[PDB]
């Protein structure tokens, strides 16, 4: 429901229109303080009209208009007002909603800025792994599956849009030893280790290994595998290469910083 | 002395003086009681509207709204209104400007809204306190109720021409040899001066040329010293 942001923007716009009206009528209530060469400050008056032209910005709200026109009479809210009149203590529900949203955003910002850790070091479960894999499989166009043909370690494969499927061996976490193979795969009777490529997919595997060694966290493997899955899914397009042309080399793929760009650019 | 009347049986000065002995209320009746013809003097009478009419209107309106301010942080509050003679001069002024409005439509508005003119009830209450303030009389309670409520015609922010203080007998003086630290009658009191603004003794600080056309009477009257206005200064136009 991003229309709330649009309505807040419209409120800010109309408040700015009122403020600009007040400001221009106040400026008209004063003359040239000290010009001594030309009363060019009257041009600021015209500039004030530009702020009044910002009223047309409120007309932009007509594009954001038609945000809500439905039934759903306030979404299951009325309990005491439209219900038991004696049930007056209702608003506690809305208070709790606001409290929870505030706590959520507060803790989110706190965790986001707490990246500057201060802990030096630490000095003085296959079912869980399969469950984490299945939970990560919950994203669209990211059909993954595992079989564990050899060993107690995890053998996971991912196929997003093309025949560029990737295999990643895990040890219940921090899945290292990545191998991407475009257009064949599981030769013999299980996953293979051919690692054949077109001198570019091998580079992609190198990038994946670099990320795995880079996105390795000291604990909490959930966030680790989540960042891993997002980093891999970011390859769904492979069609744009900023900071250079589209043919800087054999192929231009390296989104390590949440944005794809031309390869060989570190 | 603006009475450039036709030759009559008596002079305009003594006639306007005896105009004080007039009816109780309804100045629109007093004007026909005394006279209404021999008062015009110029077609270009548009001189007191932008300068004096608003001034006298604000003065009388403050005099009105001062009545409910009896319990002020002062024994006489803001003013006295115990003379009546000055109020008689004010009544002469208001009736002559009524004649002016009858002649020149550039009269004195109520300055806020709803002229429904509106000076009638004003003059009525002034005369009501007049019979309480002519001579050997005390101040009245009905007039209190009549003045207490206010109409949609009551502005504020009057000039109150006065001089800055200098109470440095033996107590305190915050000044030096230089660098004065900052902390009008014919209007011309903007937020920041943008003209000559010839500083004066107490409050005038009026512009030197005044951009006048026929109001030269005031300028030619205030060239010399003024009332508490012999201190004609040259305070610079340090507008801020």
From Swiss-Prot, chain A:
<dbReference type="GO" id="GO:0035019">
    <property type="term" value="P:somatic stem cell population maintenance"/>
</dbReference>
<dbReference type="GO" id="GO:0060261">
    <property type="term" value="P:positive regulation of transcription initiation by RNA polymerase II"/>
</dbReference>
<keyword id="KW-0539">Nucleus</keyword>
<comment type="similarity">
    <text>Belongs to the Mediator complex subunit 27 family.</text>
</comment>
<feature type="modified residue" description="Phosphoserine">
    <location>
        <position position="118"/>
    </location>
</feature>
<dbReference type="GO" id="GO:0061630">
    <property type="term" value="F:ubiquitin protein ligase activity"/>
</dbReference>
<keyword id="KW-0597">Phosphoprotein</keyword>
<keyword id="KW-0010">Activator</keyword>
<dbReference type="GO" id="GO:0000151">
    <property type="term" value="C:ubiquitin ligase complex"/>
</dbReference>
<dbReference type="GO" id="GO:0032968">
    <property type="term" value="P:positive regulation of transcription elongation by RNA polymerase II"/>
</dbReference>
<dbReference type="InterPro" id="IPR021627">
    <property type="entry name" value="Mediator_Med27"/>
</dbReference>
<protein>
    <recommendedName>
        <fullName>Mediator of RNA polymerase II transcription subunit 27</fullName>
    </recommendedName>
</protein>
<dbReference type="GO" id="GO:0005654">
    <property type="term" value="C:nucleoplasm"/>
</dbReference>
<dbReference type="Pfam" id="PF11571">
    <property type="entry name" value="Med27"/>
</dbReference>
<feature type="modified residue" description="N6-methyllysine">
    <location>
        <position position="120"/>
    </location>
</feature>
<comment type="function">
    <text>Component of the Mediator complex, a coactivator involved in the regulated transcription of nearly all RNA polymerase II-dependent genes. Mediator functions as a bridge to convey information from gene-specific regulatory proteins to the basal RNA polymerase II transcription machinery. Mediator is recruited to promoters by direct interactions with regulatory proteins and serves as a scaffold for the assembly of a functional preinitiation complex with RNA polymerase II and the general transcription factors.</text>
</comment>
<keyword id="KW-0805">Transcription regulation</keyword>
<dbReference type="GO" id="GO:0051123">
    <property type="term" value="P:RNA polymerase II preinitiation complex assembly"/>
</dbReference>
<dbReference type="GO" id="GO:0005730">
    <property type="term" value="C:nucleolus"/>
</dbReference>
<dbReference type="GO" id="GO:0005634">
    <property type="term" value="C:nucleus"/>
</dbReference>
<dbReference type="GO" id="GO:0070847">
    <property type="term" value="C:core mediator complex"/>
</dbReference>
<comment type="subunit">
    <text>Component of the Mediator complex, which is composed of MED1, MED4, MED6, MED7, MED8, MED9, MED10, MED11, MED12, MED13, MED13L, MED14, MED15, MED16, MED17, MED18, MED19, MED20, MED21, MED22, MED23, MED24, MED25, MED26, MED27, MED29, MED30, MED31, CCNC, CDK8 and CDC2L6/CDK11. The MED12, MED13, CCNC and CDK8 subunits form a distinct module termed the CDK8 module. Mediator containing the CDK8 module is less active than Mediator lacking this module in supporting transcriptional activation.</text>
</comment>
UniProtKB/Swiss-Prot annotation, chain B:
<comment type="subunit">
    <text>Component of the Mediator complex, which is composed of MED1, MED4, MED6, MED7, MED8, MED9, MED10, MED11, MED12, MED13, MED13L, MED14, MED15, MED16, MED17, MED18, MED19, MED20, MED21, MED22, MED23, MED24, MED25, MED26, MED27, MED29, MED30, MED31, CCNC, CDK8 and CDC2L6/CDK11. The MED12, MED13, CCNC and CDK8 subunits form a distinct module termed the CDK8 module. Mediator containing the CDK8 module is less active than Mediator lacking this module in supporting transcriptional activation.</text>
</comment>
<feature type="repeat" description="WD 4">
    <location>
        <begin position="69"/>
        <end position="110"/>
    </location>
</feature>
<comment type="function">
    <text>Component of the Mediator complex, a coactivator involved in the regulated transcription of nearly all RNA polymerase II-dependent genes. Mediator functions as a bridge to convey information from gene-specific regulatory proteins to the basal RNA polymerase II transcription machinery. Mediator is recruited to promoters by direct interactions with regulatory proteins and serves as a scaffold for the assembly of a functional preinitiation complex with RNA polymerase II and the general transcription factors.</text>
</comment>
<protein>
    <recommendedName>
        <fullName>Mediator of RNA polymerase II transcription subunit 16</fullName>
    </recommendedName>
</protein>
<feature type="repeat" description="WD 5">
    <location>
        <begin position="189"/>
        <end position="228"/>
    </location>
</feature>
<comment type="similarity">
    <text>Belongs to the Mediator complex subunit 16 family.</text>
</comment>
């Amino acid at each position: 429901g991003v229309n709330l942001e649009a309505f807040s923007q419209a409120i800010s716009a109309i408040q700015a229109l009122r403020s600009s009206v007040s400001r221009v009528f106040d400026c008209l209530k004063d003359g040239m303080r000290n010009k001594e060469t030309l009363e060019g400050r009257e041009k600021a008056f015209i500039a004030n009209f530009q702020d009044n032209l910002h009223s047309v910005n409120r007309d932009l709200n007509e594009l954001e208009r038609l945000s809500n026109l439905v039934g759903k009479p306030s979404e299951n809210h009325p309990l005491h007002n439209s219900g038991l009149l004696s049930l007056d203590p209702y608003s506690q529900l809305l208070q709790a909603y606001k409290w929870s949203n505030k706590l959520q955003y507060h803790a989110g910002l706190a965790s986001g800025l707490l990246n500057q850790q201060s802990l030096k070091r630490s000095a003085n479960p296959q079912y869980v792994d399969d469950v984490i894999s299945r939970i990560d499989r919950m994203f669209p166009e990211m059909s993954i599956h595992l079989s564990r043909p050899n060993g107690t370690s995890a053998m996971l494969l991912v196929t997003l849009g093309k025949v560029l499927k990737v295999i990643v061996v895990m040890r219940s976490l921090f899945i290292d030893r990545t191998i991407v193979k475009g257009y064949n795969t599981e030769d013999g009777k299980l996953d293979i280790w051919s690692k054949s490529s077109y001198q570019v997919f091998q580079k992609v595997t190198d990038h994946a290994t670099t990320a795995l060694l880079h996105y390795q966290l000291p604990q909490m493997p959930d966030v680790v595998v989540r960042s891993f899955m997002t980093w891999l899914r970011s390859y769904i397009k492979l069609f744009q290469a900023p900071c250079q042309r589209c043919g800087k080399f054999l192929q231009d793929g390296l989104p390590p910083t949440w944005r794809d760009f031309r390869t060989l650019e570190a | 002395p603006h009475f450039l009347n036709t030759p009559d049986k008596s002079p305009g000065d003594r006639l306007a003086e005896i105009c004080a002995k007039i009816t109780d209320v309804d100045i629109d009746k007093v004007m026909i009681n005394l006279k209404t013809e021999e008062f015009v003097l110029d077609m270009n009478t548009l001189q007191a509207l932008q300068q004096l009419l608003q001034w006298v209107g604000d003065f009388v309106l403050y005099l009105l709204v001062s009545l409910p301010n009896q319990g002020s942080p002062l024994r006489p509050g803001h003013s006295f209104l115990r003379d009546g003679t000055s109020l008689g001069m004010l009544r002469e002024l208001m009736v002559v400007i009524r004649i002016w409005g009858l002649l020149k439509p550039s009269c004195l508005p109520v300055y806020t809204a709803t002229s429904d003119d509106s000076m009638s009830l004003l003059f009525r209450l002034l005369t009501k306190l007049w019979i309480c303030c002519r001579d050997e009389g005390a101040a009245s309670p009905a007039s209190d109720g009549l003045v207490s409520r206010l109409q949609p015609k009551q502005p504020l922010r009057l000039r109150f021409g006065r001089a800055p203080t200098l109470p440095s007998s033996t107590s305190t003086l915050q000044l030096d040899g230089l660098t004065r630290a900052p902390g009008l009658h014919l209007g011309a009191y903007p937020t920041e001066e943008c003209k000559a603004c010839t500083r004066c003794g107490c409050v005038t600080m009026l512009k030197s040329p005044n951009k006048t056309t026929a109001v030269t009477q005031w300028e030619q009257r205030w060239i010399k010293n003024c009332l508490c206005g012999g201190l004609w200064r040259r305070v610079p136009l340090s507008c801020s």
